[PDB]
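Notes for week 9. Today we move from apo structures to complexes. The key idea is that a small molecule is not decoration. When we ask for a structure prediction with zinc ion present, the ligand SMILES becomes part of the input, just like the chain. The input block below holds both the sequence and the ligand string. Read it once before you look at the output, and try to guess where the molecule might sit.
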Amino acid sequence: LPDLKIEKLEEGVFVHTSFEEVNGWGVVTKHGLVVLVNTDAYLIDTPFTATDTEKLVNWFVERGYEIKGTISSHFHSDSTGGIEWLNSQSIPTYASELTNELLKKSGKVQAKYSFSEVSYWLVKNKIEVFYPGPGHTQDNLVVWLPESKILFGGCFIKPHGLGNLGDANLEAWPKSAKILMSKYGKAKLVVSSHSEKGDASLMKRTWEQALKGLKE
Ligand SMILES: C[C@@H]1[C@H]([C@H](C(=O)O)[C@@H](C)O)N=C(C(=O)O)[C@H]1S[C@@H]1CN[C@H](C(=O)N(C)C)C1
Ligand SMILES: [Zn+2]
Ligand SMILES: [Zn+2]
């Protein structure tokens, strides 16, 4: 029931938070990002709903910013919910090829654009996209802001319990978390889908929870 929130983290980085009841887990709080590169604005994951997605886009346009693209970090609706409404607005939506396949196979609107990298610049020297391996899902990826050393980990960062296991890969998640820890050990801030922002140790905690959950 709470409203969409938009808070500023540092210059150029905003967390958007949206809320949705999902059967069993109760009310889910979902964090995403909005990254500004001069007057360009990029959505890192969409809010749950078209409504909130529209509200978030209007909030930044009305302040003089151009929405230039969006990328979903994985296929579940807490990252993809607003894709359809953005397509109907010719706002470019991005997802990996696997994520669009998983959106396909389960009957949901796909992002307009597919890519197949494991690491690349979404915006050169500004926003990096990285796939550490399967974890929370087979397609989950992260986004890295080298200039603020902030990392968006999505639903892969689980410092207090792994969450929905339905599409997760328990065997791989520890190794993926180790790879993530080595890549981004220099992070100063780690934003996740559902936990409070923290420092680089959230990645260690995630590895521990991935390990505990494999063991059962
Ligand atoms: C229902 C959510 C959502 C779902 C998912 O991606 O699996 C879907 C609605 O988008 N993402 C989710 C996830 O585990 O990452 C789920 S579970 C819920 C999220 N915050 C809670 C949590 O993280 N705990 C450690 C208890 C539980
Ligand atoms: Zn998910
Ligand atoms: Zn989630």
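The chain is about 25% helix and 30% strand.
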